[PDB]
Amino acid sequence: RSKKSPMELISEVPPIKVDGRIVACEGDTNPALGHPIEFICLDLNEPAICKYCGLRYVQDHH
Amino acid sequence: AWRGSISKSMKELRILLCQSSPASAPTRTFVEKNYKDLKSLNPKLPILIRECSGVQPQMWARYDMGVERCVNLDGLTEPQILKALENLVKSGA
Amino acid sequence: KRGEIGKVSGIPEEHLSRKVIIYSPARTATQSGSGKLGKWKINFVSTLKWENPLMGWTSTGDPYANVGDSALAFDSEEAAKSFAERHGWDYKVKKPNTPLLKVKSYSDNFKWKGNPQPE
Amino acid sequence: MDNQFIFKYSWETLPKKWVKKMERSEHGNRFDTNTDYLFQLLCFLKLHTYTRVQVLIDICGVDYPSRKRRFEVVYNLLSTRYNSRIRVQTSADEVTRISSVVSLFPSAGWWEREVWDMFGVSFINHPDLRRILTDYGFEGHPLRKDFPLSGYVQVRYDDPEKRVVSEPIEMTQEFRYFDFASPWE
Amino acid sequence: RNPVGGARVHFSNPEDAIEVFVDGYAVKVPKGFTVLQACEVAGVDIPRFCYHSRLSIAGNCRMCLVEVEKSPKPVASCAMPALPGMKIKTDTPIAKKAREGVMEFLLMNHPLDCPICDQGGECDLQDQSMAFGSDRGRFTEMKRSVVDKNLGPLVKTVMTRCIQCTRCVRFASEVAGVQDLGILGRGSGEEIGTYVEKLMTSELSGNVIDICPVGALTSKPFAFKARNWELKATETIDVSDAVGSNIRVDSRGPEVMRIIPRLNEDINEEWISDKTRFCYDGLKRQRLSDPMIRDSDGRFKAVSWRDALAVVGDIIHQVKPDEIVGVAGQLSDAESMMVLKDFVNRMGSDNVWCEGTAAGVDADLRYSYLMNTSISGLENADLFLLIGTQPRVEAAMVNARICKTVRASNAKVGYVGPPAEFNYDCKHLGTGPDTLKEIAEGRHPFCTALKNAKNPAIIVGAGLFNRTDKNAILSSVESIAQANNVVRPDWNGLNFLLQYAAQAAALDLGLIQQSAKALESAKFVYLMGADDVNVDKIPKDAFVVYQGHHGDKAVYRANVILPASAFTEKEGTYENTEGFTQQTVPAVPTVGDARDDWKIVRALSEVSGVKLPYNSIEGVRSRIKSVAPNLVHTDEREPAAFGPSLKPECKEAMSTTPFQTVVENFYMTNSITRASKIMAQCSAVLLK
Amino acid sequence: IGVPPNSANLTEARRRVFDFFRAACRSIPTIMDIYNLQDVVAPSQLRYAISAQIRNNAHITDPKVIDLLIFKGMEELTDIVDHAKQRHHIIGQYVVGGKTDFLKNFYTSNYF
Ligand SMILES: CCCCCCCCCCCC(=O)SCCNC(=O)CCNC(=O)[C@H](O)C(C)(C)COP(=O)(O)O
Ligand code: SF4
Ligand code: SF4
Ligand code: FES
Ligand SMILES: [Zn+2]
Numbered sequence A: 001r002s003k004k005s006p007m008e009l010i011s012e013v014p015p016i017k018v019d020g021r022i023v024a025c026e027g028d029t030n031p032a033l034g035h036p037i038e039f040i041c042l043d044l045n046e047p048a049i050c051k052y053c054g055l056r057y058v059q060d061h062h
Numbered sequence B: 001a002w003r004g005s006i007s008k009s010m011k012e013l014r015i016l017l018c019q020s021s022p023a024s025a026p027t028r029t030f031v032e033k034n035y036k037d038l039k040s041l042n043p044k045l046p047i048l049i050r051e052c053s054g055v056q057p058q059m060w061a062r063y064d065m066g067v068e069r070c071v072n073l074d075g076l077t078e079p080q081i082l083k084a085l086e087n088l089v090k091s092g093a
Numbered sequence C: 001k002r003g004e005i006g007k008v009s010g011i012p013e014e015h016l017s018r019k020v021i022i023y024s025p026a027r028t029a030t031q032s033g034s035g036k037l038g039k040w041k042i043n044f045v046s047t048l049k050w051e052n053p054l055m056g057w058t059s060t061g062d063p064y065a066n067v068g069d070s071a072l073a074f075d076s077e078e079a080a081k082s083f084a085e086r087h088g089w090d091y092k093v094k095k096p097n098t099p100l101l102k103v104k105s106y107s108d109n110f111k112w113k114g115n116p117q118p119e
Numbered sequence D: 001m002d003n004q005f006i007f008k009y010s011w012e013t014l015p016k017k018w019v020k021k022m023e024r025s026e027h028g029n030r031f032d033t034n035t036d037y038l039f040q041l042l043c044f045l046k047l048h049t050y051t052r053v054q055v056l057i058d059i060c061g062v063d064y065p066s067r068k069r070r071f072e073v074v075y076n077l078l079s080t081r082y083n084s085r086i087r088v089q090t091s092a093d094e095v096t097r098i099s100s101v102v103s104l105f106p107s108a109g110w111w112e113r114e115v116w117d118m119f120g121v122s123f124i125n126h127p128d129l130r131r132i133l134t135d136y137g138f139e140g141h142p143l144r145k146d147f148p149l150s151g152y153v154q155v156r157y158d159d160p161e162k163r164v165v166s167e168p169i170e171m172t173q174e175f176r177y178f179d180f181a182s183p184w185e
Numbered sequence E: 001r002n003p004v005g006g007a008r009v010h011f012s013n014p015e016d017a018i019e020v021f022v023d024g025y026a027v028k029v030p031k032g033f034t035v036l037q038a039c040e041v042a043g044v045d046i047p048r049f050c051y052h053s054r055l056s057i058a059g060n061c062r063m064c065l066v067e068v069e070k071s072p073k074p075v076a077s078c079a080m081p082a083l084p085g086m087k088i089k090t091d092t093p094i095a096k097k098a099r100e101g102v103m104e105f106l107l108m109n110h111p112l113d114c115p116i117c118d119q120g121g122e123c124d125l126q127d128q129s130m131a132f133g134s135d136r137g138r139f140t141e142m143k144r145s146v147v148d149k150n151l152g153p154l155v156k157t158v159m160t161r162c163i164q165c166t167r168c169v170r171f172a173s174e175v176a177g178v179q180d181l182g183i184l185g186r187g188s189g190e191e192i193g194t195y196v197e198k199l200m201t202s203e204l205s206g207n208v209i210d211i212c213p214v215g216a217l218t219s220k221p222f223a224f225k226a227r228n229w230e231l232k233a234t235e236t237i238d239v240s241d242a243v244g245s246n247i248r249v250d251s252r253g254p255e256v257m258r259i260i261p262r263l264n265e266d267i268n269e270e271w272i273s274d275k276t277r278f279c280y281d282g283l284k285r286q287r288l289s290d291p292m293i294r295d296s297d298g299r300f301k302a303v304s305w306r307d308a309l310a311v312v313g314d315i316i317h318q319v320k321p322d323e324i325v326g327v328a329g330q331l332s333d334a335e336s337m338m339v340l341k342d343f344v345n346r347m348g349s350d351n352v353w354c355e356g357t358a359a360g361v362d363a364d365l366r367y368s369y370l371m372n373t374s375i376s377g378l379e380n381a382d383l384f385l386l387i388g389t390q391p392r393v394e395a396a397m398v399n400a401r402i403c404k405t406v407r408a409s410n411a412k413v414g415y416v417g418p419p420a421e422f423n424y425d426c427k428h429l430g431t432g433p434d435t436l437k438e439i440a441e442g443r444h445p446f447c448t449a450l451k452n453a454k455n456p457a458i459i460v461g462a463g464l465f466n467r468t469d470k471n472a473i474l475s476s477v478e479s480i481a482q483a484n485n486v487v488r489p490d491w492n493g494l495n496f497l498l499q500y501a502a503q504a505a506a507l508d509l510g511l512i513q514q515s516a517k518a519l520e521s522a523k524f525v526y527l528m529g530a531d532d533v534n535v536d537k538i539p540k541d542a543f544v545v546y547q548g549h550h551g552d553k554a555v556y557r558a559n560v561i562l563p564a565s566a567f568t569e570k571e572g573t574y575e576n577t578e579g580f581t582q583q584t585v586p587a588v589p590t591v592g593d594a595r596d597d598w599k600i601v602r603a604l605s606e607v608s609g610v611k612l613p614y615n616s617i618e619g620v621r622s623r624i625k626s627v628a629p630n631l632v633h634t635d636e637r638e639p640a641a642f643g644p645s646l647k648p649e650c651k652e653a654m655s656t657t658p659f660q661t662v663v664e665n666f667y668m669t670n671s672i673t674r675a676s677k678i679m680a681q682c683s684a685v686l687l688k
Numbered sequence F: 001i002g003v004p005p006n007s008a009n010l011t012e013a014r015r016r017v018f019d020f021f022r023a024a025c026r027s028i029p030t031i032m033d034i035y036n037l038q039d040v041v042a043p044s045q046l047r048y049a050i051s052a053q054i055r056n057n058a059h060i061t062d063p064k065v066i067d068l069l070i071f072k073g074m075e076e077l078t079d080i081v082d083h084a085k086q087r088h089h090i091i092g093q094y095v096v097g098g099k100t101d102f103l104k105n106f107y108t109s110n111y112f
Helices: A006-010 B025-041 B078-092 C013-017 C077-087 D003-013 D038-047 D108-119 E035-041 E093-106 E124-132 E167-176 E205-211 E280-284 E305-315 E334-346 E376-380 E396-409 E433-441 E445-451 E470-483 E503-508 E597-607 E617-624 E678-685 F010-026 F028-034 F045-056 F063-081 F087-093 F101-108
Strands: A016-018 A022-025 A038-041 A056-059 B012-018 B047-052 B058-062 C019-023 C040-043 C049-051 C058-060 C090-094 D019-023 D030-033 D055-063 D071-079 D084-092 D097-099 D122-124 D153-158 D163-168 E018-021 E026-029 E065-068 E155-157 E182-184 E191-193 E217-219 E232-237 E246-251 E256-261 E292-294 E300-302 E324-328 E383-387 E412-416 E427-430 E456-461 E494-497 E524-528 E543-548 E560-563 E573-575 E581-583
Touching: B012 B025, B025 B047, B025 B078, B058 B078, C019 C077, C040 C077, C077 C090, D003 D019, D003 D084, D030 D038, D038 D071, D038 D084, D038 D097, D055 D108, D108 D122, E026 E035, E035 E065, E065 E093, E093 E124, E155 E205, E167 E182, E167 E205, E167 E396, E205 E217, E205 E256, E256 E280, E280 E678, E292 E305, E305 E560, E305 E597, E305 F101, E324 E334, E334 E503, E334 E524, E334 E573, E334 E597, E334 E617, E376 E396, E383 E396, E383 E445, E412 E433, E412 E445, E427 E433, E433 E445, E433 E470, E456 E470, E470 E494, E503 E573, E543 E597, E597 F101, F010 F028, F010 F045, F010 F063, F028 F045, F028 F063
Parallel strands: A016 A056, B012 B047, C019 C090, D030 D084, D097 D122, E324 E524, E383 E412, E383 E456, E412 E427, E456 E494, E524 E543, E543 E560
Antiparallel strands: A022 A038, B012 B058, C019 C040, C049 C058, D019 D030, D055 D071, D071 D084, D153 D163, E018 E026, E155 E217, E182 E191, E232 E246, E246 E256, E292 E300, E292 E560, E573 E581
8 A cells, every 4th residue: 555645544543532631642652662742632623633643632522 | 598408418417425524515515505496497307416425526417328427526616516517518418 | 455375375266266245143033042143254155056956955066165154263353354365355344233232121011101181 | 290290390490481371270281382482392391301201192283263373283292201291382374484393203294294284384494394195286275274175176087088087076965064053052 | 341242232321320240240231221131231141031122021931030139039130120239140059040940840841842843953942941951850740732723824833832921922012013912811721822713914923933932933834844054044135125124044055945034223123024024935936047039929939148138139229219118126236227227328218217116206315215214213203294105014114113113102193195004003184185285284283293293203105206296295295394393403304215125226326217108109128127017008019128037917028038036146235215225145046047137238238239338246336336326335324415495496286186005915016925825825814 | 305494585585486496497307208298398388387377476575475385386396296196287287378258258157
């Protein structure tokens, strides 16, 4: 699947459901092998994008 | 009546001078007591008075095709400056 | 210009007739610090650059492309003028623009407007 | 033996008209002298019993374009007997000929040739003062602050001419100078 | 020792000058300076985050805390006034421990996104953290975060990096004049924003990118493009308007990356407009790069320089001398205008003029087209009378200084012109010439304030020069100026504000139109970068040559296209509205086969069998020295010599048509902005 | 042998210039044999070349600058005497050698 650019590949990952109003993204299961810690505020309607990973986080209930 | 045909022979009259000096003082007097009369008799001639700090008093004159004549007004009185202007007007064209 | 040092230096004659600008770089607008001030530089006006048509890199044919920005710096205007005079470079000096310290006090934020005027 | 002793001894024994600047620190005890007294000072410091400096470590130049006397010539010295180091400095511009010390230290020849090659400082009474490091026919002294990093000429093989030729320099990618200086220094 | 940054302290009198000890050093400062300013005089540079010399004092960040002997607690040096005999201490353990405490607090909720921050190598927070901060962080808990908000197409906003210095709020409230930004909320949850979804519509809105010490406010077009250490800084000036703001062009190779302001206390004062800041985009779009001549079918073929010059020199010899017209552009420098004037004069014609104010204006005395009161001198005025001018769109920095004078000295502004929007309170006296007659005769309530003002300032606009009743209006304004004293030896108030960068140099050099019906009876028109003229006036038989750097409507009618270099690619002299001559410094190489304007005109003269004595740029400046000798004495503050008394009496009648607006689109004025991509999304969402 | 002490007046500088010129002229026969310049150049064209260099460097009035120029010329002469430099180099340096200049430069490039 080399035809898919990294933009299209990161645009297909479903947003991660988070219960709270804020989530911390590190980029990997092991913190030392990822990107610097990024705290994301989930106080909007659109999914919130990590500025390192491109991963999207959305608030679960409210 | 040479003051009424300046526009017929000339096409531009530049009077360079300095505003803070004792050499351009007779040039400043000439500009003050003669600009309004010359500009009134010649409403279309562009009599340009440009001044700077380190500038020698001069009086330029463009003619029919780019021709220019200059007179150094550094040792002249006001009547002498007027007579020089007469020489540029009459003899020039 | 007594460019004798330029003749006994080794600079080629073509580069000894360059026109340079002696100036003091000013403080950047994105920072409030004033550490990179007071030094004078010689600007060679080296702009003849193009693009490598293999990788898009910036190519040049001017030896004085980065000298005045990288190595050649002076502590005063007189030093740069003397350097240019001895190297036979035609130079023009740009005097730096300096800030003026005006009177500012915190109490001016809170000043009486005046009696209500029904004008 | 030590920076505290060498400084005080040289303060007293040395003629005063030679040295004009004496820094005493842990970075190094320096002596700054005029160029017309350098040979005298180095001959005194090579023969005196309590200052037996018999090794010339190196001779280097430093370029200060903002000074009137542009070049600074530094003589790093070593005394094996007393286990101490002395540094002697002079200053010279581009058209002054300073005295050579090859008579005292035979090893000074190549360092003086390198200083002349790199900075353009000439030495009086040097047996042979020719360039030692730069290419044959090199024009300019590279270690000066006004000399461009990449130089003025470039070398390539010219097939029609059947020899290696020198041409004006033309970089495919210019040197990118990055200004990391901070305004809060 | 010298003040930090070469700051000049102006002592009004030697008597009012207190003495302080910054670090045991005797320092003399006037009464009114603060501890921070006194330290700045003594060479000591205090850390600061929320203090800006052009903004009101607000001791928020607590970073400039110093030690004072008669103080139990550290004092904020930005707000504490200096007292006689006060002993300041900056390098004591108290001041240090305060600084590493404040830095530790500031770097506690700050996001770990330096690598992706556009303020990476130019951030005040990390530069001061390295210098005045500590080494290890004791904070491990969860940080706070905020959502990002859209402030328009110019300012990119990442508010998680906000340090809450409120400098943007103070700038918007005081300097910009458009109150739309403020601190919302209470406590650690306080945020900077507009509350409602609105965009920054101020022409000086881009200056919040520079005043922000962190990467919270950054440029959106210049997002992630490059880092500051990759950029070569060239100190150049503006040609977008006639103010001539001092800018600093940063480039990475043969293209320009960004434009940021440059300090000039007399012209721009650390600020530039949004049209200045984001005009660099058009310098790389639709650029003419090759000489081109139309074909029989009507298409432009790329041709060499020799053949194009041959064609134009062959056609120039077939038209009558009075049939030749040369029109300069608004971006033209003085040398090219002098060369064009000489060329046209030698061919036998006298029709040379500029794009804008070139309807027959008399440039005979040099006070009638200049800001006879310096821009920095407008800060002493007590009453501004804006006759038919809108400085907000014409000269944005003059408007900024007028707003400064109004908000600080409580000055009064009276406006006579078409309806418009002002960022300061203004009284709409009228909308046409009749208002000037009403003011002149008297009994108008504004006339009382005008005659009871110590330093009135009348600012006439350049748009008042294309009217048919120009002489009558200029006589009414001069009558108002004489009756109500504004022009005295100790204060000159009569001002004329130009809109184009080339107008001042053109008027100094004598480039004034002679015949009104000159572009209708022409046969060879040399448009020297003049695309702001309506080409539909040009007859269909005329041979039009367009010599410029960008393609516009004039290109679609030109017969020969001669590519030119932009203002960032040449050495040229430009004159301000106030008569101040400055020079541009080349920053990037010219694109394609384009040449400097004066070179192209001189080569055309040579091919057309007309010899010009000069052959180099230094030869041109010697010729200029015999015409306008003040255009070669650059960086000199030469005041005007004579006054309005010399003008002959002109008894015309003022017309009845109301004044017009000269600038309709502020983001679409010159050809560079007209070809820019940023100025389109700015004129599409920011203009109402 | 050793580098001579720096001169004190212009007369000594002129004497050193003449001595260097004479040495260079005596070095001409050696170059014609070390490099195959026999059927290339007359034995006087090179002499004229050194004379032309001395003459276009003849506006110097500083004895130190003159001494440095002489020293550099002597270094160049010594290098040429040895086989250090390539053959075409001296033939590329030591050989004696219409509308408007401005218009040709304009046709060439914008950067004069
Ligand atoms: C193959 C050979 C290799 C080496 C060839 C040589 C290469 C270097 C050429 C020399 C480079 C120099 O500039 S070294 C020589 C430069 N030094 C001077 O020119 C002194 C100033 N000139 C004068 O004083 C007078 O004009 C004077 C000309 C003396 C006579 O005129 P008078 O007496 O009436 O006064
Ligand atoms: S604002 Fe400064 S400290 Fe904060 S992330 Fe950006 S560069 Fe780093
Ligand atoms: S956005 Fe920038 S200027 Fe405004 S308060 Fe925050 S840090 Fe200060
Ligand atoms: S700069 Fe003074 S408290 Fe912020
Ligand atoms: Zn992430």
